[PDB]
Design a protein around this ligand. Structure first.
Ligand SMILES: Nc1ncnc2c1ncn2[C@@H]1O[C@H](COP(=O)(O)OP(=O)(O)OP(O)(O)=S)[C@@H](O)[C@H]1O
Ligand SMILES: Nc1ncnc2c1ncn2[C@@H]1O[C@H](COP(=O)(O)OP(=O)(O)OP(O)(O)=S)[C@@H](O)[C@H]1O
Ligand SMILES: Nc1ncnc2c1ncn2[C@@H]1O[C@H](COP(=O)(O)OP(=O)(O)OP(O)(O)=S)[C@@H](O)[C@H]1O
Ligand SMILES: Nc1ncnc2c1ncn2[C@@H]1O[C@H](COP(=O)(O)OP(=O)(O)O)[C@@H](O)[C@H]1O
Ligand SMILES: Nc1ncnc2c1ncn2[C@@H]1O[C@H](COP(=O)(O)OP(=O)(O)O)[C@@H](O)[C@H]1O
Ligand SMILES: Nc1ncnc2c1ncn2[C@@H]1O[C@H](COP(=O)(O)OP(=O)(O)O)[C@@H](O)[C@H]1O
Ligand SMILES: [Mg+2]
Ligand SMILES: [Mg+2]
Ligand SMILES: [Mg+2]
Ligand SMILES: [Mg+2]
Ligand SMILES: [Mg+2]
Lengths: 25, 571, 577, 370
């Protein structure tokens, strides 16, 4: 008859960042 | 993080008054007057006036024609680009989003209008699958006194909304009905003086109706409210630029035709009073590119004019025809020339590859959850891409019975449904079905295989009864064959004129080419190949070797004994 | 801060505009509109997108432009100047809004913005610290001042048409490279400036032939980008190459030398190289590949007829189906056909596109697909080399949908990509190889006498490939079976390679003439061609020698004597020290 | 590099886009192209138009040592550019230009647009495609030049010029035959690397290997045997002059494999012969040692022979069960995960395993199921 296709679902990696500051003086 | 104000703009200018949205405005006002869950959701489509409803509410408050309880409110339109600016920071979105809310608390009567809600409320800062995207507004919307007017499309509503039940309950859907041509005619009338003052032009009533009617007929991709204004706006700019000392301030229907054509990417098809000139002599100009089957031209040209006269049916195509004649007569030539004449595209399909049971889905598309669903169906896709093209289906009789049912639904209702839920409009497509052996007779002595009741036997009455008119094509007469071969010789002449040579060929050469090229069964299909090798290949080599590069003179010579076409070269 | 390009035109510093007339009217058309009045030029670099904006200011000075916008003074802004003083706290934003306030007070002007993708792309663009995307929205929404931008198809797709605000503010314009004749006129305009700078003089034929030939050997940029550089480079190279007796005169021969160096070719390029390469195409190809005299000759005639020009210019140069079994040097002639014509080779194995989904990958997949980011392989490959040859092996295995994309090339010679660029096929030749029919041709029948004549294998070609597709094809070149003489040369080729590898170790190899014949019948299979000749050599010749080399008399280059045994009819190997 | 250097001078003399961009692959001698240009100036061979023109090599690290409180980055670049511009003859040279363009902003864009100062930039084909094509403003001024590789004979001269430094450091003498051997051998086997870099790596390695073996000063003269050893080690091609210790394993590979697995001698012979063929050198240089498909009835030693072969040869067995990879999406495991997806951290199982064990036998059990 017919072939039942399957659709895979991709996952993306997104990561937040933090900044460690250095006092000027 | 500043946010644009919609009341300040309307008090100075730049906010266009909204007309004909009484029902939608009342619903938004009623929703905004609620104690809890007072967050309207303008669910619409693309091109419809979604932002107009929001901006219309601003000019209503300024003018004062609003309930006193709903008065003194200031609609704020935040800049998504501002909040979304800044990345790779733990609290940038939270600080920007919570700054806007804090600055809004000072005005307990202010309203927030967020355009394209799905962009920032679908995934605000969903880094690494974070669940903070729309959890900030959810408590604020249900409990908080801050209102959020949202505007999204119907498709996005299903894709994202209604899945997060918590967020969906805090929004009140406001359905838009895509106002008809009559509603859009009143809208453009109210805006006519504004555009006329900017461009210093004037629009006729005929042009207004023509622009809206032509955009829906040809510009199917865009919706009526925005696309109609686009035509009016473009006609004003073109009506002012094109005149050179003419001072044609008025904007007639002619200017509308130019802009709609150009923006629709068509070869001048959408013009008024221009087609009538071609319709007057459509058969004449067609007879100069086709020789024979003259009776068929009359049937085809009259039905075309019949449909174009505006007297046809709204729930059926312009005209369904079943061209019937032996192979090679030239039904495909009539169609390939009709499309160029009428300025429409050409769609060509062969039912020889759709004779299987599983291949029928290639036209409409595979059902969901099965192979072939993603790309869709070539038939519905091509129709949506070119709703004014001419549909050509070669060898329809070979098609499986299921395919005939598909065509029956088309001819009966004039519309098909794609596997993705789309609607393929067939109301502006010329449906053309062509119907007609190579193997020699299986007998001791070979015999002729040349072949009104034949169609009835090979086609069910339900299909024949749905045809507008069955045009018959006559077998190529001996006299007519001499005319057909002349078209190829003159076609090569104009092609050769670019190089700078003139072929001395006369009727003596065409005598042999005729019988060799034309076959009773194959017709004139080998005719193209005849010139491809007999006439083109010999001249090609000498033309390039240097003897005739800088101008050349050629001729043809046919010897009775040799039974072949010799050639003469001069320079 | 900003630069008034309009003032430059009055001063006379700007140059005249040569061509792109149709595009100029569209810009004027959009500017006069009340809404969606911001023009947007989307095109590939080198097309001269900025030329249109620069020329627009020039025409206003002439007064041909309508008087409605005659007083308007088009301005321009450079992100570099705006990006300066990064140390200051928001000076970029503070000075940008200040500029708008000055422009707003005037309330009559246009502002060109080169590389607008960067301004809107607040961090989207590589190394982008700009945050002016939000800043432009207030001015554009008010509509007091119009803006003209510039972007590419890549950025336009990924960034533009997604934001509804930009969709209702910017209008897509299709800037396209000009005709070859138009390019000549443009060079003529800039002649006094370029000639004066280098104090040289080039004839009309030099700049004319340069554009017609530079397209063939250069692909990195569009037509009027390299041509302006080629004449500039030619004058510079001529100015300094002669130590003394400066040859300021520039001829067609001088431009051929400079283009050869950048092209990285050994001077093969010529003004009429195509005519020269075509005449000697047949003789220079048969020598390279032995056999297939009938097939090779037919192929050469087809390319000659196409180059003659007595056909349809939109159709591709040639569509050929290399029918016949593999191992008969079909890919070899294709490889040598490109090498002879001085063009690259684009080999694509269609066996990896045996599924419907993969078909879309060739012309660009939908968003979120690996192919989508890369783009259409067929379109991108052709764009990178618009003169190379396309090879699609095993077309009988490809999905029927693949034929649809090929039909558009053979019928229109152009394939629209999702980015919006149109591929050029009028200068590309497509050659397809297929094994269909060979299996049936070698299918022994059910009878006492085998039906030796089973060459009627055309029905299979017609059965697999729909008539529509094969109808457009010029000729179904049928590759013959290598004669015993050709097979002998193939054996020597493999033997020579073995001897070369053996020579590095001091080992000679002697093979009798009769032994080679044994390899010919076994090595060459009618159904598989000469492909098993590389495997039989390894199994019959390399294996015995390997055992003796590791432990035997052949440890250090002694001797080899290969001879066939008549009594046993099997190869015999003699080893000596 | 007379043809490559010619390209740089002509573009520099051009009125517009006078910024030669020496785009080449890693270890192609890109810096030498610009370093060589300075030499010709003193010699005077350069054309008179560009004669007497100073060349300054910018140091990214020196300028990056910002001491001021965020004001050093702009002040250093601003003052440096003016010093080069006032002369009007200097042609700045910046190696690894990609670093300067990247944030660390550059502020050199106005200088490039004006064109008063000429700046030379070196960048790899990779980085050139990633960033320069995106910014048309930056790449428009720079004219991409092509540098693929030097000639075979010319490379021997470059090695001779650099030979005294290596000889003194390693206290060894390189014979003329050895240098020619290294260039010819290296290019033929190490296809991935380029002629200039790999040619100096084997030379440097060959000297260290000779000196290290004897404790006292000895083995000064270097023979071609060392060159073959180091070039074979990096290329991994089987070294010639096989030791008698390793000539027993191959000799008795079939007998050992026949004791563990009885019958099916043809399979053992094919595997042993192919392995022996590779060591001899009569093998493909762009294909695996042997591609064998084992089929037959159940329990006939198809998998056992492969497992024992690994044990006999003392090489790791990269056994992969293809039954797991029924779906197309599972191919990501073997080839590798996408760069930006969640699984980017994990590498390709097949790719990483092969890299870890180059000579390891790869057993794809039940390949048909894949
Ligand atoms: N009556 C005609 N007048 C002019 N050219 C013709 C005529 N008949 C055939 N030709 C030419 O012959 C070409 C090949 O015929 P086709 O168009 O392939 O025929 P066809 O459509 O298969 O035939 P039927 O009879 O319509 S199924 C046409 O495209 C024309 O160029
Ligand atoms: N034409 C040449 N003349 C002289 N020395 C050359 C030449 N070509 C290469 N070399 C040598 O090659 C080396 C220079 O390599 P570099 O150009 O500095 O490499 P690189 O560009 O820094 O490499 P990567 O891989 O791109 S960081 C020195 O040993 C040079 O002497
Ligand atoms: N020819 C053989 N000689 C010795 N032991 C064998 C032989 N064939 C199989 N065995 C033994 O049988 C068991 C399985 O052998 P394997 O070679 O792993 O089987 P296999 O060929 O992978 O099986 P399938 O069913 O074909 S996947 C182990 O104990 C082997 O040692
Ligand atoms: N009923 C209406 N009355 C007046 N203008 C309308 C109306 N509907 C749509 N428009 C016009 O549509 C244009 C573009 O669409 P818009 O109303 O902004 O909606 P959307 O943002 O959904 O496209 C606006 O300039 C607006 O004036
Ligand atoms: N039609 C034209 N008229 C005049 N000059 C042109 C034309 N087309 C290209 N040029 C010139 O060729 C170059 C094209 O550069 P361009 O493609 O505009 O650069 P970019 O892609 O960086 O904007 C410029 O020197 C420009 O002046
Ligand atoms: N006519 C011929 N002249 C010279 N060599 C030929 C000829 N026909 C085949 N060969 C050689 O025989 C082999 C043909 O198979 P090949 O092209 O290697 O197969 P595949 O394309 O499957 O890798 C090649 O080594 C090719 O060079
Ligand atoms: Mg809107
Ligand atoms: Mg430009
Ligand atoms: Mg081959
Ligand atoms: Mg260096
Ligand atoms: Mg097993």
């Amino acid at each position: 008859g017919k072939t039942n296709d399957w659709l895979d679902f991709d996952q993306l990696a997104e990561e937040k960042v933090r900044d460690a500051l250095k006092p000027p003086s | 993080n500043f946010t644009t104000n919609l009341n300040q703009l309307a008090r100075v200018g730049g906010i266009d008054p909204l007309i004909g949205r009484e029902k939608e405005l009342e619903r938004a006002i009623q929703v905004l007057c609620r104690r809890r869950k007072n967050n309207p959701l303008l669910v619409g489509e693309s091109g419809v006036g979604k932002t107009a409803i929001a901006e219309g509410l601003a000019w209503r408050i300024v003018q004062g024609d609003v309930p006193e309880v709903m008065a003194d409110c200031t609609i704020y339109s935040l800049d998504i680009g501002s909040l979304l600016a800044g990345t790779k920071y733990r609290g940038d979105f939270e600080k920007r989003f919570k700054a806007l809310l804090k600055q809004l608390e000072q005005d307990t009567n202010s309203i927030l209008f967020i355009d394209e809600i799905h962009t920032i409320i679908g995934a605000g800062a969903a880094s690494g699958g974070q669940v903070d995207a729309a959890n900030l507004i959810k408590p604020l919307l249900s409990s908080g006194k801050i209102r959020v007017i949202g505007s999204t499309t119907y498709q996005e509503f299903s894709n994202i909304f209604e899945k997060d039940r918590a967020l969906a309950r805090r929004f009140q859907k406001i359905d838009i009905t895509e106002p008809s041509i009559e509603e859009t005619v009143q809208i453009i009338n109210g805006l006519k003086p504004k555009y006329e003052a900017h461009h210093d032009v004037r629009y006729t009533a005929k042009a207004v109706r023509a622009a809206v009617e032509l955009a829906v007929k040809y510009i199917n991709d865009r919706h009526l409210p925005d696309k109609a204004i686009d035509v009016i706006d473009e006609a004003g700019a073109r009506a002012r630029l094109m005149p050179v000392s003419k001072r044609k301030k008025t904007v007639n229907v002619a200017d509308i035709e130019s802009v709609v054509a150009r923006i629709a990417r068509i070869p001048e098809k959408s013009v008024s009073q221009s087609d009538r000139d071609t319709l007057k002599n459509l058969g004449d100009r067609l007879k100069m590119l086709v020789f024979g089957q003259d009776k068929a031209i009359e049937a085809l040209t009259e039905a075309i004019k019949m449909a174009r006269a505006g007297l046809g049916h709204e729930h059926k195509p312009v005209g369904s025809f079943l061209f019937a004649g032996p192979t090679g007569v030239g039904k495909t030539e009539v169609t390939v020339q009709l499309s160029k004449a009428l300025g429409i595209e050409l769609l060509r399909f062969d039912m020889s590859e759709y004779m299987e049971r599983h291949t029928v889905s290639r036209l409409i598309g595979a059902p969901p959850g099965y192979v072939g669903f993603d790309q869709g169906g070539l038939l519905t896709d091509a129709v949506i891409k070119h709703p004014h093209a001419v549909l050509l289906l070669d060898e329809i009789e070979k098609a499986h019975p299921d395919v005939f049912n598909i065509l029956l639904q088309v001819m009966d209702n004039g519309t098909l449904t794609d596997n993705n839920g789309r609607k393929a409009d067939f109301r502006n497509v010329v449906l053309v079905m062509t119907t007609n052996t190579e193997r020699k007779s299986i007998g001791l002595i070979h015999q002729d295989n040349s072949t009104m009741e034949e169609i009835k036997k090979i086609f069910t009455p339900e299909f024949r009864n749905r045809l507008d008119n069955i045009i018959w094509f006559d077998h190529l007469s001996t006299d007519v064959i001499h005319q057909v071969v002349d078209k190829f010789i003159v076609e090569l002449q104009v092609q050769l004129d670019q190089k700078g040579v003139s072929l001395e060929v006369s009727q003596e050469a065409r005598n042999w080419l005729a019988e060799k090229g034309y076959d009773r069964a194959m017709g004139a299909r080998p005719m193209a190949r005849v010139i491809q090798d007999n006439l083109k290949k010999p001249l090609a080599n000498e033309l390039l070797f240097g003897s005739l590069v800088d101008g050349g003179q050629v001729t043809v010579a046919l010897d009775k004994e040799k039974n072949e076409l010799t050639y003469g070269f001069q320079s």
